[PDB]
RNA sequence: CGCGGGGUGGAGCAGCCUGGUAGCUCGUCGGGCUCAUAACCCGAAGAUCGUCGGUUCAAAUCCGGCCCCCGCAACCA
């Protein structure tokens, strides 16, 4: 019985909910690893990150290198003769002389189910294109992105209330649980690596403002589902007078129209429905600049002038 | 030292600059009316204006300290 020697390697809280796992699970964690201090929030205050924090407490062994592609960082990692290396959620690449660094490789959890989703936001690109279902795969890192052999899998349905928040959420059950058993055949030798099928690879590129500022030229489906998918960050917005006002939720009415896509049908307590490139999108729940979500009642109830039928949102 | 908006009956806002004067759009309850209504009309309840203190005959308004909320940006992948 020796505990597997791990360096974790992770940012946000999503990986935080891995390391704090792993911890709570009796693991020896020897080193963390997580993107260098920044600005980050009003202020621009330098904060710590989720996992540091998490670390800091613990009393763990941080490592914030800008980059492992040089030498002297590359250390780092094989001065502390690790078995496994576990990453999640980790903006810096993985080096091939790292990635042979550990006894036992590097290992990701990957927020998808694979090959589907290689990419940086498979959480979100999932529900936002529109899948059943979505889940994490525990995989051995390769060369290149998330091309590695599958290890280990676990998924969950994605509801039709669901943003991205809640399916970060889900997976934040799933993933440590898939990790640590995965981590156990792992040391037991019992581990069944898949390879990945190239037929079934989609990637999910990153998330960006101008995405999420609402094109009316879209369905209204898939607005439906980026009012979601872009919760909680960007946040589908619109522009009203030269600001954004960000939509939280957006029901869609099946009833096709030819008006103009931006033009507003209706704006009544039951939303304000704006045509879409096909159906009509009813939004509910809006954010306006320096206040908090409202619903389309208590909006109208003092921005009428905002949504008046006939008139058309870019 | 990053820029910026906001905290007023239950809800969304105006009123502040140029001190007195409680507004607007709704919700609620009662009544009126229609075949009926989520529609209209009339009436009512309901706010020590975020908090503490100062000027003041008098403060939502002008001055100071504080707590809270949000937008950009920044950040995370
Ligand atoms: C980011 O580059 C990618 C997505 C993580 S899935 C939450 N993986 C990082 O380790
Ligand atoms: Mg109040």
Redesign the pocket.
């Known amino acids: 019985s020796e505990s597997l020697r791990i360096i974790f390697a992770?940012?946000?809280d999503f990986a935080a909910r891995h390391l704090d796992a792993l911890l709570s699970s009796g693991h020896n964690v020897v080193g963390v690893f997580?993107?260098?201090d920044?600005?980050?929030?009003?202020?621009?205050?330098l904060?710590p990150?989720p996992v540091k924090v998490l670390a800091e407490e613990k009393g763990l062994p941080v490592f914030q290198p800008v980059s492992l592609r040089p030498q002297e960082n590359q250390q780092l990692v094989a001065e502390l003769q690790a078995d496994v290396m576990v990453v999640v959620?980790?903006?810096?690449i993985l080096p091939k002389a790292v990635l042979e660094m550990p006894r036992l490789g590097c290992i990701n959890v990957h927020g998808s189910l694979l090959p589907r989703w290689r990419g940086?936001?498979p959480i979100?690109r999932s529900l936002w294109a529109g899948d059943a279902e979505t889940g994490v795969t525990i995989m051995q890192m390769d060369v290149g992105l998330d091309t590695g052999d599958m290890l280990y899998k676990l998924s969950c349905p994605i509801t039709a209330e669901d943003t991205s928040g809640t399916l970060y959420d889900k997976l934040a059950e799933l993933g440590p649980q898939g990790l640590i058993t995965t981590l156990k055949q792992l040391a037991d030798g019992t581990a069944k690596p898949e390879v990945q099928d190239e037929t079934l690879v989609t990637y999910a590129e990153?998330?960006?403002?101008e995405e999420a500022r609402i094109d009316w030229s879209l369905s209204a489906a898939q607005l439906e589902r980026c009012i979601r998918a872009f919760n909680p960050?960007?946040?589908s917005?619109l522009e009203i007078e030269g600001?954004?006002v960000?939509v939280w939720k957006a029901s869609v009415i099946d009833t096709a129209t030819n008006a103009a896509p931006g033009t507003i049908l209706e704006a009544?307590?039951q939303g304000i429905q704006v045509a879409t490139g096909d159906g009509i999108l009813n939004l509910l729940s809006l954010?306006?600049?320096?206040?908090?979500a409202?619903?389309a009642?208590?909006?109208?109830?003092?921005?009428?002038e905002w949504f008046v039928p006939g008139n058309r949102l870019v």
């Open positions: 992770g940012t946000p997580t993107q260098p920044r600005p980050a929030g009003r202020g621009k205050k904060m990150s959620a980790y903006g810096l940086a936001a979100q990153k998330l960006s403002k960050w960007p946040m917005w600001q954004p960000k009544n307590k954010q306006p600049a320096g206040k908090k409202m619903s009642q208590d909006l109208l109830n003092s921005r009428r």
